[PDB]
Design a protein around this ligand. Structure first.
Ligand SMILES: OCCCNc1cc(-c2ccnc(Nc3cccc(Cl)c3)n2)ccn1
Length: 345
């Protein structure tokens, strides 16, 4: 199961590779490949990702992963190792490999497993997942971290359904934004792209990641992406078809006249006991104007999450909620408002 020393691109890389055994392929695709392995020293399960870097774009996977590894946040993957390997199909290619703790599934597959059985995922799972996903972007967006992920989607939100845990991963597109500096607008997967990105703004803020998270909340409750456009213009049309056309002043700030569709009509879920609360939260995430979207630490205090504070609340398999849900890092606690601290800590 040892990694092949001959594939190492250099001595540092051979030494890092000797730390890990490979067990099996977990998944593969345009991003490259992810193997399940094990750290030999600890027995710990790791995900070994061979990174394919598109040279039309700046890839910051390694540098952001190294910045975030200082924090050890419970809802962000933690870098264990990085090394370079020679290509298998052509040994002149060299690839970055990043090693992090293994998470068994993607949010995409976990949700698709329910919908392929004609049922929405259990409401308590959608809720603990959303809580942890909002926590991950709260941490990213702290003034001391200031990372905009820019590509949050159900394929890079990882989950362990059995314990209700969630981790954000895939920082190749992430960047520290500045109101004074420009960025590529064609970033993000189309269905998750915020209105300000659709309009081609080169200056934007971390609120783009709040929009993506709102999109994902809706997707967990619907079974498909909520805003499925065929292109930049189609994307804006699908958003307005669902949300309602925004005022002319809103559209001029970002740069048909739809009434929009009530959430109750979109999701067709009359069993969800706290739907009014869920849909209030979703509307607060999906504000057209970035400055109007509910900020993560405040969203964590939203009444939708109240039952996550009760010890009697269990996951669908009768397991306790994750122990780290309300374990916040000092860098988070120290910038909370008194009300957020009272509620969450
Ligand atoms: O589409 C899945 C995410 C691919 N990108 C990715 C994935 C990871 C990552 C980290 C930890 N555990 C896993 N598990 C896992 C499980 C099934 C399939 C696949 Cl492929 C992976 N993946 C990190 C950065 N980037």
């Amino acid at each position: 199961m040892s990694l092949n020393a001959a594939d190492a691109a250099d001595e540092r890389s051979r030494k890092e590779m000797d730390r890990f055994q490979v067990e099996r392929m977990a998944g593969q695709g345009t991003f490259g490949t992810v193997q399940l392995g094990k750290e030999k020293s600890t027995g710990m399960s790791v995900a070994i990702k061979k990174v394919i870097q598109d040279p039309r774009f700046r890839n910051r996977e390694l540098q952001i992963m190294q910045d975030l590894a200082v924090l050890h946040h419970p809802n962000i993957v933690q870098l264990q190792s990085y090394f370079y390997t020679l290509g298998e199909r052509d040994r002149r290619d060299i690839y970055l490999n990043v090693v992090m703790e293994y998470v068994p599934d993607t949010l995409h597959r976990c949700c698709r497993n329910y919908y392929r059985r004609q049922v929405a995922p259990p409401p308590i799972l959608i809720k603990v997942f959303l809580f942890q996903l909002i926590r991950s972007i709260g941490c990213l967006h702290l003034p001391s971290v200031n990372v905009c992920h820019r590509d949050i989607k159900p394929h890079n939100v990882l989950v362990n359904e059995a314990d209700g845990t969630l981790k954000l991963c895939d920082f190749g597109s992430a960047k520290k934004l500045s109101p004074s500096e420009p960025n590529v607008a064609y970033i993000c997967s189309r269905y998750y792209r915020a209105p300000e990105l659709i309009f081609g703004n080169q200056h934007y803020t971390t609120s783009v990641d709040i929009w993506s998270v709102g999109c994902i909340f809706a997707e967990m409750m619907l079974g498909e992406p909520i805003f499925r456009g065929d292109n930049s213009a189609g994307q804006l049309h699908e958003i307005v078809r669902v949300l309602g056309c925004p005022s002319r002043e809103v559209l001029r700030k970002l740069n048909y006249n739809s009434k929009g569709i009530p959430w109750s009509s979109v999701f067709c879920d009359h069993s969800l006991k706290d739907a009014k609360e869920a849909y209030d939260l979703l509307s607060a995430l999906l504000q057209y104007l970035p400055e109007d979207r509910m900020k993560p630490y405040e969203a964590l205090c939203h009444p939708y999450f109240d039952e996550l504070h009760d010890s009697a609340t269990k996951l669908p398999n009768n397991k306790d909620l994750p122990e780290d849900l309300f374990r916040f890092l000092p860098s988070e606690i120290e910038v909370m408002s008194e009300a957020q601290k009272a509620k969450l800590v």
